[PDB]
Amino acid sequence: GAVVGGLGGYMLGSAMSRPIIHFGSDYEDRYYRENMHRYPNQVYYRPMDEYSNQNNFVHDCVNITIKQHTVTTTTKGENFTETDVKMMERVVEQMCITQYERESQAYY
Amino acid sequence: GAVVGGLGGYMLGSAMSRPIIHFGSDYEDRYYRENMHRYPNQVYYRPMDEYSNQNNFVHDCVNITIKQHTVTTTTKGENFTETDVKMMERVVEQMCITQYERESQAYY
Ligand SMILES: [Cl-]
Ligand SMILES: [Cl-]
Numbered sequence: 598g599a600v601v602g603g604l605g606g607y608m609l610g611s612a613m614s615r616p617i618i619h620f621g622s623d624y625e626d627r628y629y630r631e632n633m634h635r636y637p638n639q640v641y642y643r644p645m646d647e648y649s650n651q652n653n654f655v656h657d658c659v660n661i662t663i664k665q666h667t668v669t670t671t672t673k674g675e676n677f678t679e680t681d682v683k684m685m686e687r688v689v690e691q692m693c694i695t696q697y698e699r700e701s702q703a704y705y
Numbered sequence: 706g707a708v709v710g711g712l713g714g715y716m717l718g719s720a721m722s723r724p725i726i727h728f729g730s731d732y733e734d735r736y737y738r739e740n741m742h743r744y745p746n747q748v749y750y751r752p753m754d755e756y757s758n759q760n761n762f763v764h765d766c767v768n769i770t771i772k773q774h775t776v777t778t779t780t781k782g783e784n785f786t787e788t789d790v791k792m793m794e795r796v797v798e799q800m801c802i803t804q805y806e807r808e809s810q811a812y813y
Binding site: 663 | 718721723724726731732733735736737740741743744745746747748750753759762763766767770771774775776777778779780781782784785788789790792793794795796797798799800801802803804805807808809812813
């Protein structure tokens with residue numbers, strides 16, 4: 598809900614399909630596939646009349662877009678994927694078991 | 706900052722070291738390693754005197770602990786890891802490039 602500093606003068610583009618990007622490592626390749634929805638699908642940018650080259654336009658766009666995405670608030674639930682749910686059920690169960698042993702030890 | 710329903714009567718345990726869990730698949734194995742800090746390191750539980758077996762204690766603990774973790778609010782930045790940063794720089798740059806082409810096309 599907050600806004601990163603110095604965002605005045607930037608405009609928000611219309612959504613686009615998140616690019617399908619492939620990676621060498623199978624890890625990164627699968628990771629992106631399962632997590633891309635967690636990244637933006639639109640970017641912030643300044644008026645064309647302010648630039649003389651693509652590079653500077655892109656520089657500004659990438660940096661402020663990532664910063665704004667980063668400060669954007671959200672619950673951990675929407676940030677978690679199927680994989681995370683699976684991971685948590687496993688770790689929380691082991692920890693819930695550790696808590697049981699703690700309670701039993703110092704019982705009463 | 707919010708609280709999941711029916712949390713009254715549950716107590717929050719003290720933190721513990723998140724368990725190191727290994728997986729068959731190298732993907733899940735590496736994934737957990739890089740993302741475990743995103744999961745809880747403490748669990749909610751009810752008084753020992755309310756249970757007759759470990760299973761039910763653990764059942765309650767796991768389910769409400771995950772639900773409470775899930776509703777917990779946070780910015781996307783703290784949920785992102787080194788890998789995510791890398792992913793975003795790549796996807797946002799391509800999209801920032803698409804926005805440049807859109808602006809150039811309908812220029813002025
Ligand atoms: Cl647009
Ligand atoms: Cl404790």
